[PDB]
Amino acid sequence: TVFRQENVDDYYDTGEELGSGQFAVVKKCREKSTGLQYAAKFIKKRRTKSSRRGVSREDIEREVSILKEIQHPNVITLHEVYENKTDVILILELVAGGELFDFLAEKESLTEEEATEFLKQILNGVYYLHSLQIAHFDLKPENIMLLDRNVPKPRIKIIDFGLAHKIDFGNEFKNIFGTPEFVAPEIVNYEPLGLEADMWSIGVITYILLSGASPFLGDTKQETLANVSAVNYEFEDEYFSNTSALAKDFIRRLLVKDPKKRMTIQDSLQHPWIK
Numbered sequence: 323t324v325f326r327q328e329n330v331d332d333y334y335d336t337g338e339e340l341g342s343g344q345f346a347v348v349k350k351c352r353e354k355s356t357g358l359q360y361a362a363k364f365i366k367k368r369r370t371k372s373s374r375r376g377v378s379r380e381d382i383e384r385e386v387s388i389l390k391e392i393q394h395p396n397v398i399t400l401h402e403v404y405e406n407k408t409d410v411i412l413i414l415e416l417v418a419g420g421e422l423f424d425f426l427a428e429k430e431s432l433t434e435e436e437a438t439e440f441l442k443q444i445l446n447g448v449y450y451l452h453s454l455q456i457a458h459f460d461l462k463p464e465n466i467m468l469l470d471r472n473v474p475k476p477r478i479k480i481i482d483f484g485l486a487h488k489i490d491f492g493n494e495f496k497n498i499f500g501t502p503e504f505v506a507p508e509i510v511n512y513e514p515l516g517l518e519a520d521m522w523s524i525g526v527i528t529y530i531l532l533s534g535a536s537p538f539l540g541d542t543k544q545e546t547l548a549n550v551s552a553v554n555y556e557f558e559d560e561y562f563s564n565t566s567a568l569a570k571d572f573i574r575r576l577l578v579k580d581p582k583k584r585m586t587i588q589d590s591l592q593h594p595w596i597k
């Protein structure tokens with residue numbers, strides 16, 4: 323697909339850097355015509371099959387494709403897409419609030435009820451995504467951003483659709499992932515994937531949201547992958563002493579090895595802990 327060929331620097335005033343990845347850099351920017359602030363994600367094109375650097379066109383095309391289809395309050399919105407000889411620039415909505423977990427670290431421990439306030443927003447967004455048969459495939463704290471952190475009840479936005487996929491009938495999908503600590507066993511054992519994987523991550527995220535401790539993070543990468551696969555974790559009284567029974571039951575119904583037995587996003591919204 324053909325993207326905007328004009329130089330992004332002709333319509334935007336690129337500036338400060340917000341974050342860096344192996345094949346991408348996101349800089350803050352200001353649109354010249356509106357004076358509005360956005361986020362500029364510079365994805366490095368592979369532009370040479372043999373090369374293991376840069377991202378493949380197919381992968382970029384897919385993220386853009388999914389992004390273009392998204393339109394929900396709890397999901398980042400794609401503004402424009404430019405490209406030149408080396409990069410594909412995605413002008414994304416700006417979540418000036420930064421990471422939800424950084425904002426939370428700056429306040430007194432949230433009550434379980436307040437924690438649920440944020441989690442619900444996450445669920446809403448994932449509810450939208452799964453309703454569109456789209457799996458994020460990379461849900462993790464760092465991808466839970468805040469639109470504005472200087473407001474009564476800050477809004478959360480799910481970002482990074484680089485791993486997102488359009489789950490369609492007819493053909494199974496084997497593997498694609500990131501951080502072991504947050505992926506589901508299906509991903510670890512390269513077994514067929516689906517919307518269930520996102521639900522697993524949700525359970526992992528709520529667990530951290532409540533205890534502040536990761537449920538599967540081990541000493542070595544291998545240990546984590548083994549912890550996740552063996553689906554072994556615990557609600558050690560040290561961290562889950564002030565955690566309701568309903569809270570734990572929610573996490574339990576999500577941290578299930580067998581996908582078909584795991585709670586669906588529809589179920590989670592109806593769970594008594596969420597009410």
Ligand SMILES: Cc1ccc2c(c1)c1c3c(c(C)cc1n2CCCN)C(=O)NC3=O
Nearest residue numbers: 340341348361414415416417418420464481
């Ligand atoms: C205010 C702020 C700070 C850091 C940001 C971002 C925004 C940010 C943004 C986006 C992405 C993909 C990465 C981003 N990062 C990198 C870190 C993501 N955990 C994005 O799509 N919008 C952002 O504001």
